[PDB]
Subunit: 223 residues, 4 copies
Amino acid sequence: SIEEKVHEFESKGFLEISNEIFLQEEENHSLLTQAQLDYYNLEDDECRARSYSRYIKYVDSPDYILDNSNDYFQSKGGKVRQFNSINDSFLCNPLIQNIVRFDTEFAFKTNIIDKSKDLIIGLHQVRYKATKERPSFSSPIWLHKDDEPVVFLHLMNLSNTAIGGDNLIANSPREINQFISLKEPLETLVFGQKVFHAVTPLGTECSTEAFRDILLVTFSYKE
Amino acid sequence: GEFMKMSGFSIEEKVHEFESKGFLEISNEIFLQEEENHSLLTQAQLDYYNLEDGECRARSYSRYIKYVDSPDYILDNSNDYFQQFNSINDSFLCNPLIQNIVRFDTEFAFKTNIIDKSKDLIIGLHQVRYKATKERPSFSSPIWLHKDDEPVVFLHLMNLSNTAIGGDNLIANSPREINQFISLKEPLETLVFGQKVFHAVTPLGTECSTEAFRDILLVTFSYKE
Amino acid sequence: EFMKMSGFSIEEKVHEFESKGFLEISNEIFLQEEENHSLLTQAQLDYYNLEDDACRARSYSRYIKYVDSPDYILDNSNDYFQSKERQFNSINDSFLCNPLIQNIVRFDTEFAFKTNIIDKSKDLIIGLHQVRYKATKERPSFSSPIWLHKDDEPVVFLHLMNLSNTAIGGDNLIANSPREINQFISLKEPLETLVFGQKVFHAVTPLGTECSTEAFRDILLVTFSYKE
Amino acid sequence: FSIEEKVHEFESKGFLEISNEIFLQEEENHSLLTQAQLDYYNLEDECRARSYSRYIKYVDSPDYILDNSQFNSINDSFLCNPLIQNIVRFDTEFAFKTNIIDKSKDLIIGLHQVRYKATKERPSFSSPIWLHKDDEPVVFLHLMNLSNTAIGGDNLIANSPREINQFISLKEPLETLVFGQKVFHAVTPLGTECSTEAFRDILLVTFSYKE
Ligand SMILES: [Fe+3]
Ligand SMILES: [Fe+3]
Ligand SMILES: [Fe+3]
Ligand SMILES: [Fe+3]
Ligand SMILES: [Hg+2]
Ligand SMILES: [Hg+2]
Ligand SMILES: [Hg+2]
Ligand SMILES: [Hg+2]
Ligand SMILES: [Hg+2]
Ligand SMILES: [Hg+2]
Ligand SMILES: [Hg+2]
């Protein structure tokens, strides 16, 4: 069903993917737990804590090469604003490796990404921290497009005290066309640049800290 | 000073916090002290199924004028307002709970430095029913952070479907930051806005196959001219 | 045109219900027309007309299906006898003729008749129970019996009609025996449906609210039992 | 604080709801709660997984001591946790201030670390399943963690087994419920409508007599 799903993404600019596809084997539930626990190890860089690492997919190679460099710049002392690398235990997790393969194989079946070019596969580990006096928000705060032509948003975990963090789709900034709320681990939303998207701020009306753990898998060309 | 015993009206205490912050959350406890307010609330809620309405929301508008002379509320026969919607039904405006909410809002407004008790005031009432569907989210106008034209605005939640998601309120000192996140969930929970801060309400959605609602009542205070 | 039959077969669904004793049904089968959304709103608003009991409010009406007649007639009598528990208000005519309600009843009847549980050689009572559970912070809403049980009728359809956002609880439990809970079902959106047989026990968790206003759970029961 | 009228209310009602604000007065407590919340993934197994550890308070002894005289024992890291020691200290101070706990007999302060695991095909339920009174005259229920996918797990208070009088839903970490034997209570089964496993992580602090 990848053909009709890929075609749907190309026509709409976005696609909802349910988490059941990554939850077929019973062992995946324990692998998910291990991936989820790594988000308590992310070090703080205010509203959110994140880690970044990237793979290189050379044109004819079936393999993924973890770049020793993790510099991120954005289309836009302390100029580079470099981030910590993703823990090895997270990248070696077979569930994480299987997710990126799905993301990579799906990306290659779009007309957006060509298989005759060197691709950078970006992995963004983000933990949004929300507090009663300090809600979490992104930059940009409203509707926007990501630098990378294809982006996968995978929910990893969501505190029961969290409010917000809903995803918006807009063909243009004058009106919202779709409202998607990720609730279960591994629910997935794929973004293209044909539409703007946004994430609603994360809040809590509780005395404890609310969190929203997400994994971004982006696809862009090298140099 | 600390707190009050039993009845904790503390309107002056509330006003000081409102002017100091630019916004204020008010509990529904003050509007639900009489046992018939629960049945009057039900009648007010049922009126939102009569709002008629681009299918994002259904609206009705009416306004009162409070002259400096006496402390009365005069139902204006114009109802003209540019961002012409239907007037609010007579059964809704004569509902004693709606009148008591309006009265509570007016005396709160007059105790601010913003509202001149020596100017003729327009008390606007906006009855809004946001409608949301799985293929159609509902959003406000303006869509994002903004300030309203009226110096003091009361937002009263009237009803919220259990299938509704979103519709959370944001408070921002500037358009680059979110400083406070308030999600009204119980009927008659109130938010008062000043112009010292920006606000917004996130879009309303549903992951369910049925239609979701968010029913609000806005009470605005502005000078006639 | 040439179209495909989707969802699941009613004979297949009946087989699962018979082996399991219970069956969860999605609201999609009752929401195939856009007018159904309008009919749902009218049905939902009727629950604000139910009178208070003398932990909840309810109305009852029933149809009779005689074995030797294709017709279904609205009984003028509405006496409901429940051992260890007189009169009940009848369901408003506008609710019973609401095309969405009629379609639910006809779906339930067609499902009940295709089970081996219902003996087609007896006169049937098709009972309709319109129930609004009301919960407040000082008085949660509980039923009688309060825990696991079997209903008097061999086949019962539970249709969720409405649930206030301030309500907590009201979850459905399935137990093969009173010693263990086997399944947990939470009816969330309207027209979500759960069908019970007498092969298993069931219960509904109490309804509560931590809010200062009244919380509601609007239910429709369609039961199938023998006239005599 | 008010540790006087609250004990009277608990003695009169048979149960009492305590907010988590008293356990989260410092910002260091938030980090300790996370450490205690992370220890529930180490619990070994089924409807639920649990660990048990207890302290002995001798009448002549001036303080309670960890007993080292059946499930696994609670990890030392969880017991070394100052926030966990503060909760137990608060529980003991409250329990001792009641007229239900006899100060002439040796007291057992029991700690039950329980993780309720619920899947779409297997709900999680307590034993006993329905209204009951616990063996111990005073029991403290502390919520430690609750998955966002979880449904149920609501607490019921009943004067008799035929009625529900109070309905309490613990939702945020360290919210607390105290049970006496003057009323019945129960916890509704734990379920999920989601494809993932849902958890309800709890800490019980019970006071019972040695003999
Ligand atoms: Fe983005
Ligand atoms: Fe506004
Ligand atoms: Fe029943
Ligand atoms: Fe117990
Ligand atoms: Hg920020
Ligand atoms: Hg690795
Ligand atoms: Hg809270
Ligand atoms: Hg719209
Ligand atoms: Hg839903
Ligand atoms: Hg509430
Ligand atoms: Hg779910």
